[PDB]
Amino acid sequence: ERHSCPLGFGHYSVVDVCIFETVVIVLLTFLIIAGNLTVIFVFHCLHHYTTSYFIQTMAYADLFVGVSCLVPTLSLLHYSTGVHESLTCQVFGYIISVLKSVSMWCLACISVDRYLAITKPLSYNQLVTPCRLRICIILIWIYSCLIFLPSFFGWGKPGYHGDIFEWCATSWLTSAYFTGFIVCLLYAPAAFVVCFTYFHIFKICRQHTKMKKYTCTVCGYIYNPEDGDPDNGVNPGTDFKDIPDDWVCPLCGVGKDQFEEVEEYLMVLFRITSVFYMLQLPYIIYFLLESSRVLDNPTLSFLTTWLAISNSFCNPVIYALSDSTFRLGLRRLSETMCTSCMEFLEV
Numbered sequence: 226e227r228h229s230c231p232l233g234f235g236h237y238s239v240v241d242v243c244i245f246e247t248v249v250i251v252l253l254t255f256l257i258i259a260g261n262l263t264v265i266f267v268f269h270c271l272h273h274y275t276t277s278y279f280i281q282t283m284a285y286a287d288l289f290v291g292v293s294c295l296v297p298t299l300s301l302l303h304y305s306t307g308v309h310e311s312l313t314c315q316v317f318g319y320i321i322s323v324l325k326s327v328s329m330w331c332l333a334c335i336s337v338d339r340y341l342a343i344t345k346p347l348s349y350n351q352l353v354t355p356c357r358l359r360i361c362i363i364l365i366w367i368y369s370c371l372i373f374l375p376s377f378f379g380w381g382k383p384g385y386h387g388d389i390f391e392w393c394a395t396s397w398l399t400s401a402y403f404t405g406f407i408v409c410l411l412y413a414p415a416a417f418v419v420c421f422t423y424f425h426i427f428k429i430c431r432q433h434t435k436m437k438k439y440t441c442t443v444c445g446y447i448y449n450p451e452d453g454d455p456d457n458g459v460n461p462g463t464d465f466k467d468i469p470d471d472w473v474c475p476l477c478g479v480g481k482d483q484f485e486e487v488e489e490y491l492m493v494l495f496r497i498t499s500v501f502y503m504l505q506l507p508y509i510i511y512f513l514l515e516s517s518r519v520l521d522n523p524t525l526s527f528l529t530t531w532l533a534i535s536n537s538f539c540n541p542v543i544y545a546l547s548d549s550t551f552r553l554g555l556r557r558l559s560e561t562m563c564t565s566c567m568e569f570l571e572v
């Protein structure tokens with residue numbers, strides 16, 4: 226299967242061809258499959274519930290991005306089936322664009338859900354239900370498929386996700402009509418949805434100055450400033466900063482040094498949202514310029530394409546690494562291996 230391998234410009238040879246492209250794809254295919262499979266076995270096999278479902282969905286969306294990315298890696302690894310390249314780069318580029326819309330929308334629905342919880346706190350549970358959230362999921366899956374369905378009916382190229390394959394990078398051409406359609410009906414709406422919700426959510430929060438929770442890095446005790454530690458002289462309504470240095474963890478006795486601020490779940494979702502929408506921003510700028518024929522650059526086409534695909538890997542990393550309990554799981558894991566390493570070494 227022939228590939229478009231523009232990196233290492235003019236330095237490639239019969240043994241060196243498609244090496245920088247192959248490391249990027251093979252790493253991302255691995256990091257996205259592994260990174261989401263860990264998240265769905267730890268948290269998706271008990272938070273704010275509606276968001277827990279949008280996050281669960283975009284976990285399977287991001288996993289199947291990397292599962293699809295097994296196609297380029299195996300073609301780049303000289304494994305082939307007796308099927309035209311024009312077809313496998315047409316199907317893959319469709320599947321990825323759709324999955325990329327499913328995750329992009331999932332982050333737009335979380336943003337609205339958190340908007341509605343904060344703006345209509347009386348009505349929130351009366352607007353959101355287990356049937357409404359379930360019909361909202363399938364409408365993302367239907368809408369995403371239908372914005373990238375024209376590619377199968379001669380409207381043009383819906384992205385550069387298959388431009389690693391030769392046929393898609395030189396034979397299929399993006400049409401400004403099709404690109405404008407996608408941008409206006411998918412990229413522009415989600416971007417404005419998440420810009421309006423997170424602007425107003427932080428507009429409201431900036432007035433209401435809530436006191437920060439802190440967790441014990443050793444055992445996982447949460448100092449909740451609304452409760453305090455009344456047994457040990459700590460009045461409720463005292464921030465962690467105000468407790469004297471003398472104070473110690475009630476569950477294990479470690480000092481105020483061993484306590485990290487518990488990050489707010491909204492702020493985690495704003496980070497996942499800003500990383501995701503910023504990692505595919507270069508790719509939409511290139512997608513607009515090339516469709517407008519103001520620019521053609523296969524290297525800029527490849528970097529922005531895989532910089533976007535990489536946000537299927539950042540999603541599970543921001544989510545698990547912003548959570549205090551997952552982190553503790555890893556520190557207890559290292560110790561389990563260490564004490565067993567001290568033990569297996571007793572010989």
Ligand SMILES: CCCCCCCC/C=C\CCCCCCCC(=O)OC[C@H](O)CO
Pocket residue numbers: 507522524525528529532
């Ligand atoms: C990836 C597109 C821009 C990402 C911006 C956010 C991340 C910043 C990281 C690197 C920027 C510097 C690397 C830019 C490499 C562009 C390749 C290029 O411009 O090609 C040069 C030459 O013209 C070919 O013919």
Ligand SMILES: [Zn+2]
Pocket residue numbers: 441442443444445446474475476477478479
């Ligand atoms: Zn403790």
